[PDB]
Amino acid sequence: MKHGILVAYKPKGPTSHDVVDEVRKKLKTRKVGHGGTLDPFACGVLIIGVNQGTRILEFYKDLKKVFWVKMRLGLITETFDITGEVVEERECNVTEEEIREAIFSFVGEYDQVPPAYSAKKYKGERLYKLAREGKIINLPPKRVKIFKIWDVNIEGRDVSFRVEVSPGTYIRSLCMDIGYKLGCGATAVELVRESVGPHTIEESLNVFEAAPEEIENRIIPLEKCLEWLPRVVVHQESTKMILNGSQIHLEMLKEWDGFKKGEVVRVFNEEGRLLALAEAERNSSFRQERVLTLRKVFQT
RNA sequence: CCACGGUUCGAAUCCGUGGC
Ligand SMILES: [Zn+2]
């Protein structure tokens, strides 16, 4: 049984859960999940967690994302994309220079409102559910950050570009917002999530077309996940102790790597096996206290 | 099981929290 993360590619059409079903059917296991939904009309990178890998999917939430999007100026729909009923389809007579200034006026930070068609919860209910019943909810804004925009291409009313965005940012809302800035409306007609953190679409695997053998050999083992977090190695003797319960103390450790206050760290051992994930208690600086507090432990 | 929440929308279904 494999345990880890799978950089999947979700074709345009199916929901993100559909990909989970496909992988859970191909690998004959119910323990599968993803770490960030991707709209059906969209395609691109979908982080998939297999078995014990599901237990670490939460750590992919705060990663940055890079998208390629094409929006239709003059078009506005209920869902903010081309799969939703049209509400208004007028002409957008604006110059290419205006379009660019409008697009780039969003580079930086701004308060973005979640689209009505989203998985956000309002009062014990998903927004897309309340939206399909005709009830449109305007949730308080979230201060999102647009790190950078580039590759702007203008072909009539259809404008495309790439954007690196902070976690929790909706490109759907971004398009509508840029359209609003131009005063003529805009809807996302194509969306490709090219990367989630260090994971790119180039590495992604189309589970729908891959065989169980290929999907299995593509799975990144737990020992090679969350590569960006400080690591620590304890004596192979301390293994089964932590790999069961207890905590992690100053004289169990063996190797450095600097952390912060409540920063998360990977706990390995002599044999390189990833024992668990602990949350730092104090900044790393040289004594028998709580160095790290277990926040998750994997048993295999 | 219940309640709440998370995640770029059709996750009962993955994750987290509190209660039982
Ligand atoms: Zn694609």
PDB file of C-alpha atoms (C1' of nucleotides) and ligand atoms in Angstrom:
ATOM      1  CA  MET A   1       0.000   0.000   0.000  1.00  0.00           C
ATOM      2  CA  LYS A   2       1.452   3.335  -1.113  1.00  0.00           C
ATOM      3  CA  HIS A   3       1.259   6.447   1.096  1.00  0.00           C
ATOM      4  CA  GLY A   4       1.797   9.952  -0.220  1.00  0.00           C
ATOM      5  CA  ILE A   5       0.795  12.723  -2.621  1.00  0.00           C
ATOM      6  CA  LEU A   6      -0.002  12.484  -6.318  1.00  0.00           C
ATOM      7  CA  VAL A   7       0.322  15.475  -8.626  1.00  0.00           C
ATOM      8  CA  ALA A   8      -2.759  14.838 -10.750  1.00  0.00           C
ATOM      9  CA  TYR A   9      -4.074  16.569 -13.861  1.00  0.00           C
ATOM     10  CA  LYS A  10      -7.838  17.147 -13.950  1.00  0.00           C
ATOM     11  CA  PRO A  11      -9.183  17.258 -17.482  1.00  0.00           C
ATOM     12  CA  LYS A  12     -11.732  19.943 -18.323  1.00  0.00           C
ATOM     13  CA  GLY A  13     -15.235  18.673 -17.537  1.00  0.00           C
ATOM     14  CA  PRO A  14     -15.222  16.478 -14.408  1.00  0.00           C
ATOM     15  CA  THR A  15     -15.411  17.751 -10.836  1.00  0.00           C
ATOM     16  CA  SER A  16     -12.404  17.464  -8.519  1.00  0.00           C
ATOM     17  CA  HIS A  17     -14.128  14.730  -6.539  1.00  0.00           C
ATOM     18  CA  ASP A  18     -14.564  12.778  -9.794  1.00  0.00           C
ATOM     19  CA  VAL A  19     -10.769  12.578  -9.985  1.00  0.00           C
ATOM     20  CA  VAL A  20     -10.712  11.279  -6.429  1.00  0.00           C
ATOM     21  CA  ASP A  21     -13.198   8.552  -7.397  1.00  0.00           C
ATOM     22  CA  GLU A  22     -11.093   7.626 -10.442  1.00  0.00           C
ATOM     23  CA  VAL A  23      -7.927   7.317  -8.355  1.00  0.00           C
ATOM     24  CA  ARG A  24      -9.739   5.499  -5.562  1.00  0.00           C
ATOM     25  CA  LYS A  25     -11.098   3.032  -8.153  1.00  0.00           C
ATOM     26  CA  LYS A  26      -7.783   2.598  -9.983  1.00  0.00           C
ATOM     27  CA  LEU A  27      -5.924   1.967  -6.713  1.00  0.00           C
ATOM     28  CA  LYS A  28      -8.801   0.072  -5.069  1.00  0.00           C
ATOM     29  CA  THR A  29      -8.837   2.204  -1.900  1.00  0.00           C
ATOM     30  CA  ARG A  30     -11.370   4.552  -0.344  1.00  0.00           C
ATOM     31  CA  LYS A  31      -8.697   6.654   1.395  1.00  0.00           C
ATOM     32  CA  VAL A  32      -8.240   9.356  -1.214  1.00  0.00           C
ATOM     33  CA  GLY A  33      -8.778  13.101  -1.219  1.00  0.00           C
ATOM     34  CA  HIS A  34      -7.486  16.265  -2.817  1.00  0.00           C
ATOM     35  CA  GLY A  35      -5.930  19.368  -1.309  1.00  0.00           C
ATOM     36  CA  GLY A  36      -7.644  22.101  -3.255  1.00  0.00           C
ATOM     37  CA  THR A  37     -10.706  22.038  -5.487  1.00  0.00           C
ATOM     38  CA  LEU A  38     -10.534  23.029  -9.149  1.00  0.00           C
ATOM     39  CA  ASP A  39     -13.680  24.094 -11.001  1.00  0.00           C
ATOM     40  CA  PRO A  40     -15.210  21.644 -13.543  1.00  0.00           C
ATOM     41  CA  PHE A  41     -14.796  23.983 -16.540  1.00  0.00           C
ATOM     42  CA  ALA A  42     -11.161  24.329 -15.531  1.00  0.00           C
ATOM     43  CA  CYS A  43      -8.233  21.965 -15.857  1.00  0.00           C
ATOM     44  CA  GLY A  44      -4.745  21.694 -14.441  1.00  0.00           C
ATOM     45  CA  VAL A  45      -2.957  20.616 -11.276  1.00  0.00           C
ATOM     46  CA  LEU A  46      -4.970  18.813  -8.595  1.00  0.00           C
ATOM     47  CA  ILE A  47      -3.092  17.637  -5.485  1.00  0.00           C
ATOM     48  CA  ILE A  48      -4.298  14.132  -4.643  1.00  0.00           C
ATOM     49  CA  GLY A  49      -3.619  12.415  -1.320  1.00  0.00           C
ATOM     50  CA  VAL A  50      -3.488   8.610  -1.168  1.00  0.00           C
ATOM     51  CA  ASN A  51      -4.093   6.691   2.070  1.00  0.00           C
ATOM     52  CA  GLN A  52      -1.917   8.188   4.811  1.00  0.00           C
ATOM     53  CA  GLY A  53      -1.240  10.976   2.297  1.00  0.00           C
ATOM     54  CA  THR A  54      -4.698  12.416   3.008  1.00  0.00           C
ATOM     55  CA  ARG A  55      -3.449  13.266   6.521  1.00  0.00           C
ATOM     56  CA  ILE A  56      -1.060  15.873   5.104  1.00  0.00           C
ATOM     57  CA  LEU A  57      -3.256  17.420   2.420  1.00  0.00           C
ATOM     58  CA  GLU A  58      -4.008  20.312   4.780  1.00  0.00           C
ATOM     59  CA  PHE A  59      -0.463  21.558   4.412  1.00  0.00           C
ATOM     60  CA  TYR A  60      -0.977  22.424   0.737  1.00  0.00           C
ATOM     61  CA  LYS A  61      -3.627  25.019   1.554  1.00  0.00           C
ATOM     62  CA  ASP A  62      -1.392  27.994   2.037  1.00  0.00           C
ATOM     63  CA  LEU A  63       0.660  27.445  -1.109  1.00  0.00           C
ATOM     64  CA  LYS A  64       0.729  29.969  -3.951  1.00  0.00           C
ATOM     65  CA  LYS A  65      -0.867  29.193  -7.317  1.00  0.00           C
ATOM     66  CA  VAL A  66      -0.159  30.130 -10.906  1.00  0.00           C
ATOM     67  CA  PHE A  67      -3.005  30.237 -13.408  1.00  0.00           C
ATOM     68  CA  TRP A  68      -3.480  30.874 -17.116  1.00  0.00           C
ATOM     69  CA  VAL A  69      -6.924  32.339 -17.819  1.00  0.00           C
ATOM     70  CA  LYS A  70      -8.914  33.642 -20.785  1.00  0.00           C
ATOM     71  CA  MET A  71     -11.865  35.966 -20.064  1.00  0.00           C
ATOM     72  CA  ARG A  72     -14.637  37.214 -22.328  1.00  0.00           C
ATOM     73  CA  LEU A  73     -15.228  40.969 -22.084  1.00  0.00           C
ATOM     74  CA  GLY A  74     -18.868  41.987 -22.371  1.00  0.00           C
ATOM     75  CA  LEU A  75     -20.077  38.655 -21.053  1.00  0.00           C
ATOM     76  CA  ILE A  76     -21.427  38.101 -17.551  1.00  0.00           C
ATOM     77  CA  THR A  77     -22.921  34.848 -16.264  1.00  0.00           C
ATOM     78  CA  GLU A  78     -24.453  33.625 -13.017  1.00  0.00           C
ATOM     79  CA  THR A  79     -21.521  31.363 -12.216  1.00  0.00           C
ATOM     80  CA  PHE A  80     -18.816  33.736 -13.504  1.00  0.00           C
ATOM     81  CA  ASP A  81     -17.702  31.118 -16.088  1.00  0.00           C
ATOM     82  CA  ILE A  82     -19.003  29.811 -19.444  1.00  0.00           C
ATOM     83  CA  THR A  83     -20.950  26.949 -17.880  1.00  0.00           C
ATOM     84  CA  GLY A  84     -23.435  29.293 -16.259  1.00  0.00           C
ATOM     85  CA  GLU A  85     -26.602  30.883 -17.622  1.00  0.00           C
ATOM     86  CA  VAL A  86     -25.924  34.185 -19.381  1.00  0.00           C
ATOM     87  CA  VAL A  87     -27.172  37.329 -17.632  1.00  0.00           C
ATOM     88  CA  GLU A  88     -25.760  39.954 -19.986  1.00  0.00           C
ATOM     89  CA  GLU A  89     -23.860  39.923 -23.260  1.00  0.00           C
ATOM     90  CA  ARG A  90     -23.028  43.404 -24.534  1.00  0.00           C
ATOM     91  CA  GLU A  91     -20.157  44.860 -26.548  1.00  0.00           C
ATOM     92  CA  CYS A  92     -16.933  46.061 -24.969  1.00  0.00           C
ATOM     93  CA  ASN A  93     -15.424  48.892 -26.972  1.00  0.00           C
ATOM     94  CA  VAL A  94     -12.253  49.687 -25.031  1.00  0.00           C
ATOM     95  CA  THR A  95      -8.681  50.088 -26.279  1.00  0.00           C
ATOM     96  CA  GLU A  96      -5.975  47.504 -25.668  1.00  0.00           C
ATOM     97  CA  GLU A  97      -4.207  50.050 -23.470  1.00  0.00           C
ATOM     98  CA  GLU A  98      -7.247  50.446 -21.236  1.00  0.00           C
ATOM     99  CA  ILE A  99      -7.595  46.676 -21.007  1.00  0.00           C
ATOM    100  CA  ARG A 100      -3.938  46.325 -19.903  1.00  0.00           C
ATOM    101  CA  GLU A 101      -4.145  49.123 -17.339  1.00  0.00           C
ATOM    102  CA  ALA A 102      -7.311  47.560 -15.977  1.00  0.00           C
ATOM    103  CA  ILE A 103      -5.652  44.113 -15.731  1.00  0.00           C
ATOM    104  CA  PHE A 104      -2.487  45.446 -14.105  1.00  0.00           C
ATOM    105  CA  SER A 105      -4.336  47.737 -11.716  1.00  0.00           C
ATOM    106  CA  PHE A 106      -5.042  44.515  -9.790  1.00  0.00           C
ATOM    107  CA  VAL A 107      -1.392  43.565  -9.215  1.00  0.00           C
ATOM    108  CA  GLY A 108      -0.903  44.047  -5.482  1.00  0.00           C
ATOM    109  CA  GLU A 109      -3.618  43.549  -2.879  1.00  0.00           C
ATOM    110  CA  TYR A 110      -7.382  44.022  -2.813  1.00  0.00           C
ATOM    111  CA  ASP A 111     -10.524  42.870  -1.032  1.00  0.00           C
ATOM    112  CA  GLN A 112     -12.039  40.145  -3.183  1.00  0.00           C
ATOM    113  CA  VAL A 113     -15.549  38.802  -2.624  1.00  0.00           C
ATOM    114  CA  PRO A 114     -16.037  34.997  -3.053  1.00  0.00           C
ATOM    115  CA  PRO A 115     -18.238  34.154  -6.041  1.00  0.00           C
ATOM    116  CA  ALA A 116     -21.775  32.962  -5.290  1.00  0.00           C
ATOM    117  CA  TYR A 117     -20.899  29.631  -6.911  1.00  0.00           C
ATOM    118  CA  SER A 118     -18.278  28.448  -4.424  1.00  0.00           C
ATOM    119  CA  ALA A 119     -17.792  25.859  -1.650  1.00  0.00           C
ATOM    120  CA  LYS A 120     -17.715  28.562   1.004  1.00  0.00           C
ATOM    121  CA  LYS A 121     -20.056  27.906   3.949  1.00  0.00           C
ATOM    122  CA  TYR A 122     -22.595  30.488   5.095  1.00  0.00           C
ATOM    123  CA  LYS A 123     -24.957  29.043   7.696  1.00  0.00           C
ATOM    124  CA  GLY A 124     -24.161  25.365   7.592  1.00  0.00           C
ATOM    125  CA  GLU A 125     -24.653  25.478   3.842  1.00  0.00           C
ATOM    126  CA  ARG A 126     -22.402  25.559   0.755  1.00  0.00           C
ATOM    127  CA  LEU A 127     -22.721  28.760  -1.293  1.00  0.00           C
ATOM    128  CA  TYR A 128     -23.179  26.960  -4.592  1.00  0.00           C
ATOM    129  CA  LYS A 129     -26.104  25.130  -3.063  1.00  0.00           C
ATOM    130  CA  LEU A 130     -27.784  28.360  -1.897  1.00  0.00           C
ATOM    131  CA  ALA A 131     -26.908  29.811  -5.320  1.00  0.00           C
ATOM    132  CA  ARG A 132     -28.638  27.075  -7.291  1.00  0.00           C
ATOM    133  CA  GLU A 133     -31.788  27.745  -5.221  1.00  0.00           C
ATOM    134  CA  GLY A 134     -31.553  31.300  -6.497  1.00  0.00           C
ATOM    135  CA  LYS A 135     -30.235  32.759  -3.248  1.00  0.00           C
ATOM    136  CA  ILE A 136     -27.039  34.735  -3.922  1.00  0.00           C
ATOM    137  CA  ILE A 137     -24.894  35.404  -0.850  1.00  0.00           C
ATOM    138  CA  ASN A 138     -22.241  38.146  -0.646  1.00  0.00           C
ATOM    139  CA  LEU A 139     -19.722  36.982   1.925  1.00  0.00           C
ATOM    140  CA  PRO A 140     -17.375  39.481   3.546  1.00  0.00           C
ATOM    141  CA  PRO A 141     -14.270  40.105   1.422  1.00  0.00           C
ATOM    142  CA  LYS A 142     -10.928  38.428   1.823  1.00  0.00           C
ATOM    143  CA  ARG A 143      -7.750  40.494   1.342  1.00  0.00           C
ATOM    144  CA  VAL A 144      -6.074  38.520  -1.459  1.00  0.00           C
ATOM    145  CA  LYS A 145      -2.737  39.193  -3.097  1.00  0.00           C
ATOM    146  CA  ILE A 146      -1.994  39.250  -6.842  1.00  0.00           C
ATOM    147  CA  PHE A 147       1.768  38.769  -6.938  1.00  0.00           C
ATOM    148  CA  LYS A 148       2.219  39.132 -10.665  1.00  0.00           C
ATOM    149  CA  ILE A 149       0.493  39.152 -14.034  1.00  0.00           C
ATOM    150  CA  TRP A 150       2.084  38.472 -17.417  1.00  0.00           C
ATOM    151  CA  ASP A 151       1.671  36.960 -20.904  1.00  0.00           C
ATOM    152  CA  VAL A 152      -1.264  39.243 -21.663  1.00  0.00           C
ATOM    153  CA  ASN A 153      -2.836  38.411 -25.022  1.00  0.00           C
ATOM    154  CA  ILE A 154      -5.733  40.361 -26.537  1.00  0.00           C
ATOM    155  CA  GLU A 155      -7.782  38.802 -29.343  1.00  0.00           C
ATOM    156  CA  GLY A 156     -10.934  40.865 -29.699  1.00  0.00           C
ATOM    157  CA  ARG A 157     -13.153  40.470 -26.646  1.00  0.00           C
ATOM    158  CA  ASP A 158     -11.179  37.445 -25.474  1.00  0.00           C
ATOM    159  CA  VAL A 159      -8.205  38.375 -23.272  1.00  0.00           C
ATOM    160  CA  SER A 160      -5.838  35.868 -21.687  1.00  0.00           C
ATOM    161  CA  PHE A 161      -2.955  36.092 -19.197  1.00  0.00           C
ATOM    162  CA  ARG A 162      -1.089  34.357 -16.370  1.00  0.00           C
ATOM    163  CA  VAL A 163      -1.309  35.218 -12.668  1.00  0.00           C
ATOM    164  CA  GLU A 164       0.485  34.062  -9.543  1.00  0.00           C
ATOM    165  CA  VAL A 165      -2.015  34.299  -6.740  1.00  0.00           C
ATOM    166  CA  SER A 166      -2.153  33.912  -2.951  1.00  0.00           C
ATOM    167  CA  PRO A 167      -4.159  31.096  -1.312  1.00  0.00           C
ATOM    168  CA  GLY A 168      -7.899  31.486  -1.324  1.00  0.00           C
ATOM    169  CA  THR A 169      -7.989  33.709  -4.456  1.00  0.00           C
ATOM    170  CA  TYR A 170     -10.726  33.097  -7.062  1.00  0.00           C
ATOM    171  CA  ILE A 171      -9.739  33.830 -10.653  1.00  0.00           C
ATOM    172  CA  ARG A 172     -13.430  33.837 -11.484  1.00  0.00           C
ATOM    173  CA  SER A 173     -13.921  36.868  -9.244  1.00  0.00           C
ATOM    174  CA  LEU A 174     -10.710  38.452 -10.525  1.00  0.00           C
ATOM    175  CA  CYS A 175     -12.021  38.363 -14.107  1.00  0.00           C
ATOM    176  CA  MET A 176     -15.364  39.818 -13.123  1.00  0.00           C
ATOM    177  CA  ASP A 177     -13.492  42.478 -11.124  1.00  0.00           C
ATOM    178  CA  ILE A 178     -11.271  43.467 -14.023  1.00  0.00           C
ATOM    179  CA  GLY A 179     -14.354  43.515 -16.222  1.00  0.00           C
ATOM    180  CA  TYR A 180     -16.088  45.778 -13.759  1.00  0.00           C
ATOM    181  CA  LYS A 181     -13.054  48.070 -13.724  1.00  0.00           C
ATOM    182  CA  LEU A 182     -13.295  48.307 -17.526  1.00  0.00           C
ATOM    183  CA  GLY A 183     -17.019  48.917 -17.093  1.00  0.00           C
ATOM    184  CA  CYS A 184     -18.101  46.226 -19.502  1.00  0.00           C
ATOM    185  CA  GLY A 185     -18.023  42.954 -17.564  1.00  0.00           C
ATOM    186  CA  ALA A 186     -15.945  39.830 -18.068  1.00  0.00           C
ATOM    187  CA  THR A 187     -16.331  36.091 -17.568  1.00  0.00           C
ATOM    188  CA  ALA A 188     -13.692  33.369 -17.363  1.00  0.00           C
ATOM    189  CA  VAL A 189     -14.141  31.054 -20.374  1.00  0.00           C
ATOM    190  CA  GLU A 190     -10.958  29.018 -19.898  1.00  0.00           C
ATOM    191  CA  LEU A 191      -8.936  28.270 -16.770  1.00  0.00           C
ATOM    192  CA  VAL A 192      -5.744  26.255 -16.302  1.00  0.00           C
ATOM    193  CA  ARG A 193      -4.128  25.896 -12.884  1.00  0.00           C
ATOM    194  CA  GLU A 194      -0.529  25.469 -13.982  1.00  0.00           C
ATOM    195  CA  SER A 195       0.974  25.066 -10.511  1.00  0.00           C
ATOM    196  CA  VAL A 196       0.233  24.626  -6.827  1.00  0.00           C
ATOM    197  CA  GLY A 197       3.367  25.524  -4.888  1.00  0.00           C
ATOM    198  CA  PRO A 198       6.326  23.646  -6.509  1.00  0.00           C
ATOM    199  CA  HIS A 199       3.982  21.193  -8.267  1.00  0.00           C
ATOM    200  CA  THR A 200       3.461  21.938 -11.957  1.00  0.00           C
ATOM    201  CA  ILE A 201       1.107  20.806 -14.670  1.00  0.00           C
ATOM    202  CA  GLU A 202       4.164  19.373 -16.432  1.00  0.00           C
ATOM    203  CA  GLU A 203       4.482  16.833 -13.613  1.00  0.00           C
ATOM    204  CA  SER A 204       0.734  16.200 -13.388  1.00  0.00           C
ATOM    205  CA  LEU A 205      -0.708  12.847 -14.405  1.00  0.00           C
ATOM    206  CA  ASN A 206      -4.087  12.283 -16.045  1.00  0.00           C
ATOM    207  CA  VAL A 207      -5.424   9.506 -13.804  1.00  0.00           C
ATOM    208  CA  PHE A 208      -8.331   9.024 -16.208  1.00  0.00           C
ATOM    209  CA  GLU A 209      -5.906   7.801 -18.877  1.00  0.00           C
ATOM    210  CA  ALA A 210      -3.228   6.241 -16.675  1.00  0.00           C
ATOM    211  CA  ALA A 211      -3.207   2.630 -15.506  1.00  0.00           C
ATOM    212  CA  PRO A 212      -2.945   1.583 -11.822  1.00  0.00           C
ATOM    213  CA  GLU A 213       0.735   0.747 -12.357  1.00  0.00           C
ATOM    214  CA  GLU A 214       1.538   4.242 -13.616  1.00  0.00           C
ATOM    215  CA  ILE A 215      -0.518   6.048 -10.959  1.00  0.00           C
ATOM    216  CA  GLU A 216       1.142   3.999  -8.226  1.00  0.00           C
ATOM    217  CA  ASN A 217       4.699   4.705  -9.419  1.00  0.00           C
ATOM    218  CA  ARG A 218       3.837   8.393  -9.729  1.00  0.00           C
ATOM    219  CA  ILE A 219       2.861   8.740  -6.081  1.00  0.00           C
ATOM    220  CA  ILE A 220       5.365  10.821  -4.098  1.00  0.00           C
ATOM    221  CA  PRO A 221       6.112   8.925  -0.856  1.00  0.00           C
ATOM    222  CA  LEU A 222       5.461  10.696   2.439  1.00  0.00           C
ATOM    223  CA  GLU A 223       9.217  10.938   3.016  1.00  0.00           C
ATOM    224  CA  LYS A 224       9.463  13.182  -0.047  1.00  0.00           C
ATOM    225  CA  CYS A 225       6.457  15.451   0.609  1.00  0.00           C
ATOM    226  CA  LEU A 226       6.265  18.992   1.993  1.00  0.00           C
ATOM    227  CA  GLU A 227       9.867  19.349   0.833  1.00  0.00           C
ATOM    228  CA  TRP A 228       9.860  23.011   1.919  1.00  0.00           C
ATOM    229  CA  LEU A 229       9.482  22.463   5.670  1.00  0.00           C
ATOM    230  CA  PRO A 230      12.442  22.342   8.073  1.00  0.00           C
ATOM    231  CA  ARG A 231      13.416  18.787   8.947  1.00  0.00           C
ATOM    232  CA  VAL A 232      14.751  17.002  12.012  1.00  0.00           C
ATOM    233  CA  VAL A 233      16.135  13.505  12.537  1.00  0.00           C
ATOM    234  CA  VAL A 234      15.942  11.504  15.751  1.00  0.00           C
ATOM    235  CA  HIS A 235      17.785   8.321  16.739  1.00  0.00           C
ATOM    236  CA  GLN A 236      16.419   5.095  15.243  1.00  0.00           C
ATOM    237  CA  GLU A 237      16.032   4.123  18.896  1.00  0.00           C
ATOM    238  CA  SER A 238      13.541   6.939  19.538  1.00  0.00           C
ATOM    239  CA  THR A 239      11.542   5.687  16.554  1.00  0.00           C
ATOM    240  CA  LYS A 240       8.826   3.377  17.927  1.00  0.00           C
ATOM    241  CA  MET A 241       8.463   5.734  20.892  1.00  0.00           C
ATOM    242  CA  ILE A 242       7.420   8.770  18.842  1.00  0.00           C
ATOM    243  CA  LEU A 243       5.960   6.416  16.249  1.00  0.00           C
ATOM    244  CA  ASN A 244       3.306   5.553  18.809  1.00  0.00           C
ATOM    245  CA  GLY A 245       2.924   8.464  21.189  1.00  0.00           C
ATOM    246  CA  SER A 246       5.017  10.618  23.506  1.00  0.00           C
ATOM    247  CA  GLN A 247       6.515  13.879  22.287  1.00  0.00           C
ATOM    248  CA  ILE A 248       9.902  14.909  20.918  1.00  0.00           C
ATOM    249  CA  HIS A 249      12.646  15.981  23.301  1.00  0.00           C
ATOM    250  CA  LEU A 250      16.017  17.723  23.106  1.00  0.00           C
ATOM    251  CA  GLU A 251      17.999  14.501  23.525  1.00  0.00           C
ATOM    252  CA  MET A 252      16.267  12.378  20.891  1.00  0.00           C
ATOM    253  CA  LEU A 253      17.143  14.839  18.180  1.00  0.00           C
ATOM    254  CA  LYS A 254      20.323  14.593  16.149  1.00  0.00           C
ATOM    255  CA  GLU A 255      20.160  17.173  13.375  1.00  0.00           C
ATOM    256  CA  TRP A 256      19.605  20.887  12.888  1.00  0.00           C
ATOM    257  CA  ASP A 257      17.555  22.783  10.301  1.00  0.00           C
ATOM    258  CA  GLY A 258      16.228  26.034  11.694  1.00  0.00           C
ATOM    259  CA  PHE A 259      12.586  26.655  12.524  1.00  0.00           C
ATOM    260  CA  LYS A 260      10.469  29.436  14.038  1.00  0.00           C
ATOM    261  CA  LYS A 261       7.920  29.671  16.857  1.00  0.00           C
ATOM    262  CA  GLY A 262       4.831  27.670  15.918  1.00  0.00           C
ATOM    263  CA  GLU A 263       6.416  26.505  12.673  1.00  0.00           C
ATOM    264  CA  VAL A 264       5.811  22.959  11.421  1.00  0.00           C
ATOM    265  CA  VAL A 265       8.681  20.503  10.987  1.00  0.00           C
ATOM    266  CA  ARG A 266       9.169  17.040   9.504  1.00  0.00           C
ATOM    267  CA  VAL A 267      10.343  14.334  11.914  1.00  0.00           C
ATOM    268  CA  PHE A 268      12.548  11.669  10.304  1.00  0.00           C
ATOM    269  CA  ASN A 269      14.868   9.032  11.752  1.00  0.00           C
ATOM    270  CA  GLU A 270      18.103   7.153  11.038  1.00  0.00           C
ATOM    271  CA  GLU A 271      16.587   5.119   8.190  1.00  0.00           C
ATOM    272  CA  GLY A 272      15.185   8.257   6.571  1.00  0.00           C
ATOM    273  CA  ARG A 273      11.637   7.116   7.354  1.00  0.00           C
ATOM    274  CA  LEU A 274       9.239  10.017   7.960  1.00  0.00           C
ATOM    275  CA  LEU A 275       7.992   9.352  11.490  1.00  0.00           C
ATOM    276  CA  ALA A 276       5.723  12.356  11.975  1.00  0.00           C
ATOM    277  CA  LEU A 277       5.000  16.082  11.767  1.00  0.00           C
ATOM    278  CA  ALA A 278       5.656  18.166  14.863  1.00  0.00           C
ATOM    279  CA  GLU A 279       4.995  21.824  15.613  1.00  0.00           C
ATOM    280  CA  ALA A 280       7.966  23.785  16.960  1.00  0.00           C
ATOM    281  CA  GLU A 281       7.515  25.173  20.461  1.00  0.00           C
ATOM    282  CA  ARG A 282      10.420  27.638  20.431  1.00  0.00           C
ATOM    283  CA  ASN A 283      12.789  29.134  17.862  1.00  0.00           C
ATOM    284  CA  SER A 284      15.724  26.857  17.010  1.00  0.00           C
ATOM    285  CA  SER A 285      18.694  28.107  19.027  1.00  0.00           C
ATOM    286  CA  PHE A 286      20.683  25.516  20.982  1.00  0.00           C
ATOM    287  CA  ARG A 287      17.523  21.701  28.285  1.00  0.00           C
ATOM    288  CA  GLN A 288      14.968  18.882  28.405  1.00  0.00           C
ATOM    289  CA  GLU A 289      11.785  20.732  27.469  1.00  0.00           C
ATOM    290  CA  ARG A 290       9.167  20.392  24.719  1.00  0.00           C
ATOM    291  CA  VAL A 291      11.296  20.991  21.638  1.00  0.00           C
ATOM    292  CA  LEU A 292       8.515  19.925  19.291  1.00  0.00           C
ATOM    293  CA  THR A 293       4.931  18.807  19.892  1.00  0.00           C
ATOM    294  CA  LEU A 294       3.608  16.011  17.691  1.00  0.00           C
ATOM    295  CA  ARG A 295       0.815  17.355  15.494  1.00  0.00           C
ATOM    296  CA  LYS A 296       0.475  14.264  13.296  1.00  0.00           C
ATOM    297  CA  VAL A 297       1.993  10.757  13.295  1.00  0.00           C
ATOM    298  CA  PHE A 298       2.042   8.184  10.495  1.00  0.00           C
ATOM    299  CA  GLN A 299       1.880   4.460  11.222  1.00  0.00           C
ATOM    300  CA  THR A 300       2.753   2.024   8.435  1.00  0.00           C
TER     301      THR A 300
ATOM    302  C1'   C B   1     -23.741  10.417  15.155  1.00  0.00           C
ATOM    303  C1'   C B   2     -24.564  15.902  15.733  1.00  0.00           C
ATOM    304  C1'   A B   3     -22.794  20.972  14.935  1.00  0.00           C
ATOM    305  C1'   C B   4     -19.391  24.144  12.677  1.00  0.00           C
ATOM    306  C1'   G B   5     -15.671  25.135   9.243  1.00  0.00           C
ATOM    307  C1'   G B   6     -11.970  24.316   5.212  1.00  0.00           C
ATOM    308  C1'   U B   7     -10.729  23.718  -0.174  1.00  0.00           C
ATOM    309  C1'   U B   8     -11.081  28.081  -7.195  1.00  0.00           C
ATOM    310  C1'   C B   9     -18.484  24.897  -7.790  1.00  0.00           C
ATOM    311  C1'   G B  10     -22.124  19.210  -8.072  1.00  0.00           C
ATOM    312  C1'   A B  11     -16.251  16.166  -1.380  1.00  0.00           C
ATOM    313  C1'   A B  12     -22.570  12.179   1.777  1.00  0.00           C
ATOM    314  C1'   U B  13     -17.668  10.960  -0.038  1.00  0.00           C
ATOM    315  C1'   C B  14     -11.102  14.307   1.683  1.00  0.00           C
ATOM    316  C1'   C B  15      -9.311  17.321   5.823  1.00  0.00           C
ATOM    317  C1'   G B  16      -9.878  20.012  10.587  1.00  0.00           C
ATOM    318  C1'   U B  17     -12.382  21.496  15.174  1.00  0.00           C
ATOM    319  C1'   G B  18     -15.930  21.067  19.200  1.00  0.00           C
ATOM    320  C1'   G B  19     -19.601  18.077  21.375  1.00  0.00           C
ATOM    321  C1'   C B  20     -21.564  12.775  21.907  1.00  0.00           C
TER     322        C B  20
HETATM  323 ZN    ZN C   1      -5.454  21.197 -19.830  1.00  0.00          ZN
END
